[PDB]
Tab-separated table of N, CA and C and ligand atoms in Angstrom:
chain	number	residue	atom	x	y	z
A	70	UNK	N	123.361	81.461	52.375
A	70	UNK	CA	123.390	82.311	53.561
A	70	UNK	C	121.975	82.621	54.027
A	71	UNK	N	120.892	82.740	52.963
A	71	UNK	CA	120.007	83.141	53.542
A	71	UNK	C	119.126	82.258	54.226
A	72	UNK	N	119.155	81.061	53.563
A	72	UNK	CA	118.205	79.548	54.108
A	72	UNK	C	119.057	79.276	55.490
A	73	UNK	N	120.570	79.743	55.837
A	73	UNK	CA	121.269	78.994	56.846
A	73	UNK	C	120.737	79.928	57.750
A	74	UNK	N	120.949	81.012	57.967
A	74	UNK	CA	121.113	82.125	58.723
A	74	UNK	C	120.063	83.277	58.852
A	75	UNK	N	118.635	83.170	58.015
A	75	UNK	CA	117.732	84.611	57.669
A	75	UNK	C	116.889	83.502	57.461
A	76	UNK	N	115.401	84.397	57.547
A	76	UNK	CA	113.958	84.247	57.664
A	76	UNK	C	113.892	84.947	56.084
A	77	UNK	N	112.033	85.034	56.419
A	77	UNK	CA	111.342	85.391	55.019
A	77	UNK	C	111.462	86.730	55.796
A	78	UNK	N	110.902	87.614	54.793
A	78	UNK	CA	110.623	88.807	55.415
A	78	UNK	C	109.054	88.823	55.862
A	79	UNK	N	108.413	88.019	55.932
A	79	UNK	CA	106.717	88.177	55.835
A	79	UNK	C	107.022	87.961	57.645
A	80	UNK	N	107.624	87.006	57.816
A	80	UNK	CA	107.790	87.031	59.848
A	80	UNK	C	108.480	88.189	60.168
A	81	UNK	N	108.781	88.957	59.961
A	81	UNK	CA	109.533	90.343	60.582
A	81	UNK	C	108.403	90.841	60.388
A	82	UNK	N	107.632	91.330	59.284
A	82	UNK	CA	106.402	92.055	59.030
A	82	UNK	C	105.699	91.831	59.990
A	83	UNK	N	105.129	90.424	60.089
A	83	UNK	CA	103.740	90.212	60.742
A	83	UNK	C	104.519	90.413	62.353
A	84	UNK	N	105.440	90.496	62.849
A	84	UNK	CA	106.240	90.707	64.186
A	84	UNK	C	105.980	92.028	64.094
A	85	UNK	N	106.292	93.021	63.581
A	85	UNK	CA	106.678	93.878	63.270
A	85	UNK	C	104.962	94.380	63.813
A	86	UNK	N	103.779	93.820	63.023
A	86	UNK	CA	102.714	94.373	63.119
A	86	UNK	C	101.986	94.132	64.552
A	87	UNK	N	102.372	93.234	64.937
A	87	UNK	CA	102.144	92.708	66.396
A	87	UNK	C	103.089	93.674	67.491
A	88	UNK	N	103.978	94.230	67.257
A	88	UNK	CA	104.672	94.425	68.081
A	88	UNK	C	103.947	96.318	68.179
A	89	UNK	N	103.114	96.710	66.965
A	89	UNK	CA	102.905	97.760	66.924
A	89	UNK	C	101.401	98.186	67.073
A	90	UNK	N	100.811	97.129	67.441
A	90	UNK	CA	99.395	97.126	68.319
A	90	UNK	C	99.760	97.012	69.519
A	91	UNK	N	100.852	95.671	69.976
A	91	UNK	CA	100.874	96.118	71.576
A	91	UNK	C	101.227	97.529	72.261
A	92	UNK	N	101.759	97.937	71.582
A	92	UNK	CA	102.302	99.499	72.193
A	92	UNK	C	101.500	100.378	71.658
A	93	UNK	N	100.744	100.237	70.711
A	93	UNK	CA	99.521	101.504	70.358
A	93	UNK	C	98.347	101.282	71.863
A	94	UNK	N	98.316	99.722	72.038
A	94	UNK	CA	97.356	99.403	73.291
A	94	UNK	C	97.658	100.036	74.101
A	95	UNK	N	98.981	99.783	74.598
A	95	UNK	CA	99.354	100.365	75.921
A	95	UNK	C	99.419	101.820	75.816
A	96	UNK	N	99.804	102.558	75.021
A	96	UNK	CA	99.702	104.220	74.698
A	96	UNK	C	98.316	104.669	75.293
A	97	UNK	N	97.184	103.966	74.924
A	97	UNK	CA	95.933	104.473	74.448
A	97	UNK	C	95.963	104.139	76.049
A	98	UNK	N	95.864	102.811	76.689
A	98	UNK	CA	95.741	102.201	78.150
A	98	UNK	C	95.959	103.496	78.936
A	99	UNK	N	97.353	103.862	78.837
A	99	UNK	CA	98.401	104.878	79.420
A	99	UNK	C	97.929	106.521	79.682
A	100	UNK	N	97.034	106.749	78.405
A	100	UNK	CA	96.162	107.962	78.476
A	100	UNK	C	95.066	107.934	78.945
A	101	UNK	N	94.090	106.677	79.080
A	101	UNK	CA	93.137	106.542	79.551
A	101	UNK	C	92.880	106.543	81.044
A	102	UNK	N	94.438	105.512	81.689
A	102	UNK	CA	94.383	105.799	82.977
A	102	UNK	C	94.773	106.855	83.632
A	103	UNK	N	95.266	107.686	82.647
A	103	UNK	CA	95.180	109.260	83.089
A	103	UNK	C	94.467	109.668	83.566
A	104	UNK	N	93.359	109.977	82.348
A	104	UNK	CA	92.050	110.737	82.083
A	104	UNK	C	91.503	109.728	83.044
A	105	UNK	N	91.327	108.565	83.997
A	105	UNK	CA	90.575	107.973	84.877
A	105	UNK	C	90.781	108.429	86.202
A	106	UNK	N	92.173	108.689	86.587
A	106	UNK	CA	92.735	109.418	87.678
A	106	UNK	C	92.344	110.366	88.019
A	107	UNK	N	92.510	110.879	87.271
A	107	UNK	CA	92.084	112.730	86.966
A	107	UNK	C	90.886	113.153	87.334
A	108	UNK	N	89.640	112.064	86.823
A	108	UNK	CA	88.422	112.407	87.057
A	108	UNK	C	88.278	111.962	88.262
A	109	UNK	N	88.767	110.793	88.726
A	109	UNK	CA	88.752	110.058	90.322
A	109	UNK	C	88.745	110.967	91.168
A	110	UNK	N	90.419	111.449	91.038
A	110	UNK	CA	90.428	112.818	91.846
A	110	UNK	C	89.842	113.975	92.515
A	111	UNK	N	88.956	114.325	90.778
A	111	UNK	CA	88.268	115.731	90.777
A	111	UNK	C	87.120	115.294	91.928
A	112	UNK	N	86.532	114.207	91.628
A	112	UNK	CA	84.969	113.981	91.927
A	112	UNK	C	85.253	113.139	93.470
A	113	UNK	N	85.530	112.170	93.275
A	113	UNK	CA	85.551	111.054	94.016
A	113	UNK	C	84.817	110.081	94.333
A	114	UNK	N	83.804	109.981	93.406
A	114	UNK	CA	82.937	108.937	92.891
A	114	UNK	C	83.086	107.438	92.520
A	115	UNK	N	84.771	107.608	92.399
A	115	UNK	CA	85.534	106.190	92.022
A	115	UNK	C	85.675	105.509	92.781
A	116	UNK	N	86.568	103.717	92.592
A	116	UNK	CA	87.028	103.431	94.109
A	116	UNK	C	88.592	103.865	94.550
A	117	UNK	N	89.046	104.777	93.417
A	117	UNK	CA	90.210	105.247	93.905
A	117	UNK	C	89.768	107.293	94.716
A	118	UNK	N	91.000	106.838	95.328
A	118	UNK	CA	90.730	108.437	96.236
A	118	UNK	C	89.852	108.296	96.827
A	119	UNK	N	89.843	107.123	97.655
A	119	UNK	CA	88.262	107.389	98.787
A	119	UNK	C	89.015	107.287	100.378
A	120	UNK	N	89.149	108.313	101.031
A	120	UNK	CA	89.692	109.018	101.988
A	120	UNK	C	88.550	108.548	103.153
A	121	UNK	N	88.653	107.940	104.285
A	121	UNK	CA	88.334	107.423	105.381
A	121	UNK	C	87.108	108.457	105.098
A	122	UNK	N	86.026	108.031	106.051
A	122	UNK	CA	85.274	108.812	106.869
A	122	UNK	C	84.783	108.150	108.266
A	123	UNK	N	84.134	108.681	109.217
A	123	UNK	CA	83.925	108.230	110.660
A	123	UNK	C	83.053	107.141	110.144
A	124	UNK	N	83.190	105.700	110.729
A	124	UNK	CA	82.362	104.763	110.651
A	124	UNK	C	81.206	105.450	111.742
A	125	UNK	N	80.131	105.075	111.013
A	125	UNK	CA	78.510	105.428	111.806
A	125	UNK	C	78.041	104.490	112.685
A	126	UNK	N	79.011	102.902	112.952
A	126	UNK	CA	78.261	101.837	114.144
A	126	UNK	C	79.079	102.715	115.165
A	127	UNK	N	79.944	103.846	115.576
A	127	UNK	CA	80.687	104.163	116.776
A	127	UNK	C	79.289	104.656	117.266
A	128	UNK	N	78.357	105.156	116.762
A	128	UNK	CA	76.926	106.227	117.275
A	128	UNK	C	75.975	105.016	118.276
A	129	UNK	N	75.632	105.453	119.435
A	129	UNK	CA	74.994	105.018	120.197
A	129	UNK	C	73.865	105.381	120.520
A	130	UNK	N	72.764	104.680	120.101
A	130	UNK	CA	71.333	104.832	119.570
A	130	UNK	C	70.381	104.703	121.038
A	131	UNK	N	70.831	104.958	121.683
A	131	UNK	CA	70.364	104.811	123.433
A	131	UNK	C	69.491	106.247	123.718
A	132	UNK	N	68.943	106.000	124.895
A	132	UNK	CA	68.552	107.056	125.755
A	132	UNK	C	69.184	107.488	126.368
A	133	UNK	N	69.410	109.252	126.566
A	133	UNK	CA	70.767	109.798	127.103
A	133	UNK	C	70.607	110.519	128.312
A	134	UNK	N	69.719	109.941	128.869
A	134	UNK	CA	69.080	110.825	130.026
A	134	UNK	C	69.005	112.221	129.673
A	135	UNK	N	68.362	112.826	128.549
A	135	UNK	CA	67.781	113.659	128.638
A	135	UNK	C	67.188	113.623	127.312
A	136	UNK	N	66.206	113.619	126.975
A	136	UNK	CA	64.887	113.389	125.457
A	136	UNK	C	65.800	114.288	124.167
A	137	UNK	N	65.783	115.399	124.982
A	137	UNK	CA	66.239	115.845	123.546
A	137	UNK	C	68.449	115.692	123.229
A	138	UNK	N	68.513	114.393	123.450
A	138	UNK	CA	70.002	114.205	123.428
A	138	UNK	C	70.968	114.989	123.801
B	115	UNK	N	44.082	103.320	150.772
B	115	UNK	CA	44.293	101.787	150.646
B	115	UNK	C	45.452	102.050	149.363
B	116	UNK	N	46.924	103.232	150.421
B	116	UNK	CA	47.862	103.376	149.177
B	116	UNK	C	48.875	102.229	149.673
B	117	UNK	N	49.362	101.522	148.874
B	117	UNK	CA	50.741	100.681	149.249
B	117	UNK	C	52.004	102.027	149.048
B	118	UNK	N	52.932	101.871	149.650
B	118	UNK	CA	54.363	102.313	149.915
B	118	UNK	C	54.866	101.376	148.381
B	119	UNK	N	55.453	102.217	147.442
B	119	UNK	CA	56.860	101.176	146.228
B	119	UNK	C	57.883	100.331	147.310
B	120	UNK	N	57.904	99.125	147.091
B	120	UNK	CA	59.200	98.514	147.464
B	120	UNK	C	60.386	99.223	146.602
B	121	UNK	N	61.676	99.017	147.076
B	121	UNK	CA	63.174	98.989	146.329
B	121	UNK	C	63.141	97.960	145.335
B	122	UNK	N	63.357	98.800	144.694
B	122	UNK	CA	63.763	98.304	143.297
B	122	UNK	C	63.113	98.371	142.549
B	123	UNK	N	61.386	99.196	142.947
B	123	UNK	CA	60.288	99.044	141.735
B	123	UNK	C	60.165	100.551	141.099
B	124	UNK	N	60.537	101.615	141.661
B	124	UNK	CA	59.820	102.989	140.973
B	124	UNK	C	61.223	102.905	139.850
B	125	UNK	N	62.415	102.425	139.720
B	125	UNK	CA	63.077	102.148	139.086
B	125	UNK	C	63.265	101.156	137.875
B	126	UNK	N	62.235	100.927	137.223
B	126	UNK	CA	61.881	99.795	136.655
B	126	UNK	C	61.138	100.074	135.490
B	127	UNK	N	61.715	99.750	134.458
B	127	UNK	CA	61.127	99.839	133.014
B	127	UNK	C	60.182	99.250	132.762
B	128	UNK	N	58.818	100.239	132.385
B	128	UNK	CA	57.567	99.865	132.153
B	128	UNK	C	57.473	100.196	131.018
B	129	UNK	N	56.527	99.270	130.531
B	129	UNK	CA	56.028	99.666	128.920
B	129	UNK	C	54.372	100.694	129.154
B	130	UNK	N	54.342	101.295	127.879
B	130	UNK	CA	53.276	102.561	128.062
B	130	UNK	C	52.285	102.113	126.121
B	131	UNK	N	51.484	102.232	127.057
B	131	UNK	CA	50.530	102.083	126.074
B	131	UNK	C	49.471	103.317	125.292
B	132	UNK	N	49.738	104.148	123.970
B	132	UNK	CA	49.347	105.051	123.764
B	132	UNK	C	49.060	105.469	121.916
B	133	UNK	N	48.052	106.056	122.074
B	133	UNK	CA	47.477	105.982	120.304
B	133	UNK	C	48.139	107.119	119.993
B	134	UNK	N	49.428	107.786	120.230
B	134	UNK	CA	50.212	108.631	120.050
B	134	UNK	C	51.200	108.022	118.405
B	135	UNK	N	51.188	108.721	117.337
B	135	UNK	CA	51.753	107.409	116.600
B	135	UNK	C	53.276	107.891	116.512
B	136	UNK	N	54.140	107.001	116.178
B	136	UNK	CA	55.622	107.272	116.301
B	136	UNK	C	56.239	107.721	115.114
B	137	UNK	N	57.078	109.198	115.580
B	137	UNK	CA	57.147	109.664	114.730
B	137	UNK	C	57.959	109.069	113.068
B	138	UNK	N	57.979	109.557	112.549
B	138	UNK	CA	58.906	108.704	110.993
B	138	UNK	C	59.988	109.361	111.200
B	139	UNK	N	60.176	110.749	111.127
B	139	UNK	CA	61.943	111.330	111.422
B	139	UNK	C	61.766	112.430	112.197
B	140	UNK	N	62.120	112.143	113.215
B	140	UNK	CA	62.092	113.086	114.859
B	140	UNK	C	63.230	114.323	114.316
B	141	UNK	N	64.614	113.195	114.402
B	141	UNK	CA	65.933	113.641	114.076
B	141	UNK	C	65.681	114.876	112.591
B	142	UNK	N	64.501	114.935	111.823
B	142	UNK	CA	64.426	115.733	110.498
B	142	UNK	C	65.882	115.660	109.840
B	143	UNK	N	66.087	114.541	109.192
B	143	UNK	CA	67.170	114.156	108.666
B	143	UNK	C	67.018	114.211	107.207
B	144	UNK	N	68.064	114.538	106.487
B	144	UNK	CA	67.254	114.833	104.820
B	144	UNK	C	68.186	113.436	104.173
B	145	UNK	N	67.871	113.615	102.821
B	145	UNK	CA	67.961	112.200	102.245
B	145	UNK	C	69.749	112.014	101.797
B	146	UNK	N	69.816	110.732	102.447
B	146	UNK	CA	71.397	110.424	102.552
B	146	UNK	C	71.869	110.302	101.209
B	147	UNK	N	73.128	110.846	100.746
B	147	UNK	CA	73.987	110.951	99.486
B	147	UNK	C	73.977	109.118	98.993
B	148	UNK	N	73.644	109.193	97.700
B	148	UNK	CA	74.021	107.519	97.183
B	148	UNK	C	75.082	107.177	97.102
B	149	UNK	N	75.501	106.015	97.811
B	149	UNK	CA	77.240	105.680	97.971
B	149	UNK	C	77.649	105.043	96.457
B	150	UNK	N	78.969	104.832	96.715
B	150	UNK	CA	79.792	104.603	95.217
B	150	UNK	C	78.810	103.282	94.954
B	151	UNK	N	78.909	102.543	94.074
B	151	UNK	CA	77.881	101.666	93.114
B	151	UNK	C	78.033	100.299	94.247
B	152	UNK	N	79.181	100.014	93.682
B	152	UNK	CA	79.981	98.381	93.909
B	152	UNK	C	81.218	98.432	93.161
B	153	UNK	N	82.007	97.241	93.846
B	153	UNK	CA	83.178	96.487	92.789
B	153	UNK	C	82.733	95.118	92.517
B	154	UNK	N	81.829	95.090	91.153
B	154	UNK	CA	81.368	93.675	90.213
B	154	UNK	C	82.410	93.477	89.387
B	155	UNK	N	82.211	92.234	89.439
B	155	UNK	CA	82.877	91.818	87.856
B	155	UNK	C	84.126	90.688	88.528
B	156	UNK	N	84.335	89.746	87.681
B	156	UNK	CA	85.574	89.054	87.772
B	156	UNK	C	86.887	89.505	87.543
B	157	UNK	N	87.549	89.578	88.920
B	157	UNK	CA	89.347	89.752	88.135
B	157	UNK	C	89.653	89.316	86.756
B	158	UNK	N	89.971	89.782	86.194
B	158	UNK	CA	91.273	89.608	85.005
B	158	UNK	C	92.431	90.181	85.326
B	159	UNK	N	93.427	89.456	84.040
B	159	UNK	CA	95.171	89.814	84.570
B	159	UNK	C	95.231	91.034	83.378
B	160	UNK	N	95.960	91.779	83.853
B	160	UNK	CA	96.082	93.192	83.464
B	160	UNK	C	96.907	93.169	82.407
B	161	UNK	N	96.200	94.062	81.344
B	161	UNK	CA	96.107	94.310	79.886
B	161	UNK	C	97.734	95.006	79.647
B	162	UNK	N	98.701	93.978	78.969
B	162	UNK	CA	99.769	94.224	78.565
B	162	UNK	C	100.871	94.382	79.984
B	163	UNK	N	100.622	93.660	81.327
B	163	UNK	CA	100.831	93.603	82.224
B	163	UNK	C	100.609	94.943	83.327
B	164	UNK	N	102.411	95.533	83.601
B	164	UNK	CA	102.395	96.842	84.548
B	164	UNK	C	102.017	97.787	83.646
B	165	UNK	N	102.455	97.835	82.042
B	165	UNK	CA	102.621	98.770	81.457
B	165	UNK	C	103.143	99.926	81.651
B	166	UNK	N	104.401	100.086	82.466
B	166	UNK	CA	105.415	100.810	82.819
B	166	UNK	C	106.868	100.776	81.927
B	167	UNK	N	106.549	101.701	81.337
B	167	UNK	CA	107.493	102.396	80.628
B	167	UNK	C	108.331	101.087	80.047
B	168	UNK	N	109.239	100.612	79.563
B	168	UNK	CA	109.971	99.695	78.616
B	168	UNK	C	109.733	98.402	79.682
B	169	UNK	N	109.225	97.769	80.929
B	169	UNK	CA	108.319	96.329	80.983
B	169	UNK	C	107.390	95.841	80.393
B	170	UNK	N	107.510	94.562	80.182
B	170	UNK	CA	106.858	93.789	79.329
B	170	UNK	C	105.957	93.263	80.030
B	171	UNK	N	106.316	92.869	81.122
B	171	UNK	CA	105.139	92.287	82.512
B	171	UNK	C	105.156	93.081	83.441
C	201	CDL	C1	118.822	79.378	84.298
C	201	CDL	C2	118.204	80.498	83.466
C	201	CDL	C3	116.701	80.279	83.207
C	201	CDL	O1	116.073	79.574	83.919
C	201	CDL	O2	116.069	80.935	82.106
C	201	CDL	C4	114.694	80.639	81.955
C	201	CDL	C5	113.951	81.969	81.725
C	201	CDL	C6	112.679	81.716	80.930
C	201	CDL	O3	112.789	82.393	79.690
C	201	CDL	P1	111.399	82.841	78.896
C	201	CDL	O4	110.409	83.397	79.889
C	201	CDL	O5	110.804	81.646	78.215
C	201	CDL	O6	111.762	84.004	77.772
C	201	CDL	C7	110.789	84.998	77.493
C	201	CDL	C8	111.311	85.893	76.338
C	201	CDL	O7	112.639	85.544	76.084
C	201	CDL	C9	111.270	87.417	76.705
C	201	CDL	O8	110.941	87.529	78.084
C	201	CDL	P2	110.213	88.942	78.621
C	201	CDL	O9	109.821	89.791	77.427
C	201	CDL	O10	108.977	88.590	79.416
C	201	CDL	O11	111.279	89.795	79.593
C	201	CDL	C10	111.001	89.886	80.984
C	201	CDL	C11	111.016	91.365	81.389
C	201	CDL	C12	111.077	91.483	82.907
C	201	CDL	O12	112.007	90.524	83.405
C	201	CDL	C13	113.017	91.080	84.229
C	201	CDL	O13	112.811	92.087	84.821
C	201	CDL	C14	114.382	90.366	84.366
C	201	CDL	C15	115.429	90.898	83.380
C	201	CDL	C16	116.829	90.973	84.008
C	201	CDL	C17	117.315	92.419	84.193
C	201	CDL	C18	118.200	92.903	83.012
C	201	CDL	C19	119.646	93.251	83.453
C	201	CDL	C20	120.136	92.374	84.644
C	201	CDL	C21	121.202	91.357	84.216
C	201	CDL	O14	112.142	91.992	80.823
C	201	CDL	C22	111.915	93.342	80.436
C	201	CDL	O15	110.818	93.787	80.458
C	201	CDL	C23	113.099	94.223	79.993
C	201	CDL	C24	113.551	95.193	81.098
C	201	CDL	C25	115.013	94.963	81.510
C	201	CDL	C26	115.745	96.284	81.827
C	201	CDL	C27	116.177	96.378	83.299
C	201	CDL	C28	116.488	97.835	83.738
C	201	CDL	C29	117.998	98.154	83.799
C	201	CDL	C30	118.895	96.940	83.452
C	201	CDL	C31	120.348	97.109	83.960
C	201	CDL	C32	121.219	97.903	82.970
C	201	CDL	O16	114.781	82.846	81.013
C	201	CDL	C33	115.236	83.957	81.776
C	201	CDL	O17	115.072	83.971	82.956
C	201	CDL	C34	115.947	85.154	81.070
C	201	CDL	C35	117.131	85.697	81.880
C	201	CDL	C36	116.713	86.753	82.903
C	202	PLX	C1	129.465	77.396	49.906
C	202	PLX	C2	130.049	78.544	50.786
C	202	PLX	C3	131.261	79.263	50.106
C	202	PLX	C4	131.590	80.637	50.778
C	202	PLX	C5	131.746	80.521	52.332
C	202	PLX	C6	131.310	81.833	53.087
C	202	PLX	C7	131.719	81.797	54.611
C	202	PLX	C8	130.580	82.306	55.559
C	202	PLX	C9	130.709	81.700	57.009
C	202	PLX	C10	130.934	82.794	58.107
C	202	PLX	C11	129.684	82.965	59.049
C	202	PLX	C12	129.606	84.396	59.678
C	202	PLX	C13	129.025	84.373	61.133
C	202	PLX	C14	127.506	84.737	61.173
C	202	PLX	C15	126.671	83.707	62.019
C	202	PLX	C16	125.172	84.156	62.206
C	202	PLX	C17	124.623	83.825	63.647
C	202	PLX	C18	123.071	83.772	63.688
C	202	PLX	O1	122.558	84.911	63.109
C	202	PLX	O2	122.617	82.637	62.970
C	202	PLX	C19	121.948	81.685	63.757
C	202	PLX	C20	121.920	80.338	63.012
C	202	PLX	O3	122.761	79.417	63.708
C	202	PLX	C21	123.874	78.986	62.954
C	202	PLX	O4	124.089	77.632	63.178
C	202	PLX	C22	125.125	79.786	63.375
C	202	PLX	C23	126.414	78.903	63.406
C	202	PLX	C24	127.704	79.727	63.101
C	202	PLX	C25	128.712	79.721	64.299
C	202	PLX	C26	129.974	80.602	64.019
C	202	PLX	C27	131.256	80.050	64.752
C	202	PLX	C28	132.540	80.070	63.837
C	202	PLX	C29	133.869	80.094	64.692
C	202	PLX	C30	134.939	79.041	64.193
C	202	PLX	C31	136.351	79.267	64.868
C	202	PLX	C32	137.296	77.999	64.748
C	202	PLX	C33	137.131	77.016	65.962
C	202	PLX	C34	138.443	76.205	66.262
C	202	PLX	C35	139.335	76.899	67.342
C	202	PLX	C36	140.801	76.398	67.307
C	202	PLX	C37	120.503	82.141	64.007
C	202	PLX	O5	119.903	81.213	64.917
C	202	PLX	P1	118.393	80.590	64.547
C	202	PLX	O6	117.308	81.508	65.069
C	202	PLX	O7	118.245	79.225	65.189
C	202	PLX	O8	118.246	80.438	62.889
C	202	PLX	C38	117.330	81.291	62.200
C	202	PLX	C39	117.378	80.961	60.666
C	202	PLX	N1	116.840	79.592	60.347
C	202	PLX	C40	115.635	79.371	61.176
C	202	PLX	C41	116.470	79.616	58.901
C	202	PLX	C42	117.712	78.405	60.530
């Protein structure tokens, strides 16, 4: 039964150990992109949360008939 | 021995010649905030895919 139908146990293990780094990765991933958000947010120094501002080529660098603009 | 301006000349952009030197910041503008860095670096495919809750990709 066991040669027809079952493995060693050393492949469940080493599955077993693989299967429990990928999800420690992603845990750790999962908190990190927290704590990345979070700070994005606060500051906005990131390239997330960057909220329009007026493009500066609309400004017209001319003489306005009068010196002091 | 004055000439009369023809039309079209007292209207007319002349250049001026003067040891007046030009100013550096008229506008007194103070020093502009440093923008975000850049986005460097080569794409890569994302670490353990969406990583959304029980997906695998
Ligand atoms: C003809 C069939 C064919 O071409 O098969 C070849 C194709 C290739 O197989 P494979 O990529 O070599 O197998 C990879 C591993 O088996 C394992 O593949 P995997 O780990 O990459 O799985 C893909 C992944 C993401 O893939 C999917 O989202 C598709 C799964 C189908 C939805 C499940 C229920 C619908 C029925 O699946 C999940 O993450 C699990 C989430 C599923 C839960 C859905 C939420 C509620 C379900 C409803 C209750 O097999 C399939 O398409 C599997 C059937 C779907
Ligand atoms: C000498 C013996 C004396 C005592 C006899 C004891 C009787 C025991 C037989 C009863 C079997 C119980 C069913 C359990 C089947 C396990 C299914 C699965 O787990 O096994 C698969 C193995 O496949 C097997 O071939 C399963 C075949 C069994 C199919 C059962 C069907 C029986 C129904 C018969 C009904 C009658 C039909 C006629 C209708 C009129 C696994 O696939 P695989 O990942 O690859 O193999 C991994 C292990 N390896 C790598 C080491 C090989």
């Amino acid at each position: 039964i066991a040669r027809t139908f079952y493995d060693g146990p050393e492949k469940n293990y080493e599955k077993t150990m693989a299967i429990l780094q990928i999800e420690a990765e992603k845990a750790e991933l999962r908190l990190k992109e927290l704590e990345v958000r979070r700070l994005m947010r606060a500051r906005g120094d990131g390239p997330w949360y960057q909220y329009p501002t007026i493009d500066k080529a609309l400004i017209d660098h001319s003489p306005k008939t009068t010196p002091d603009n | 021995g004055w000439v009369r301006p023809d039309l079209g000349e007292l209207s007319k952009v002349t250049k001026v010649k003067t040891d007046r030197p030009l100013p550096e910041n008229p506008y007194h503008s103070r020093a502009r905030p440093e923008p975000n860095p850049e986005a460097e670096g080569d794409l890569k495919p994302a670490k353990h895919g969406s990583r959304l809750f029980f997906w695998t990709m």
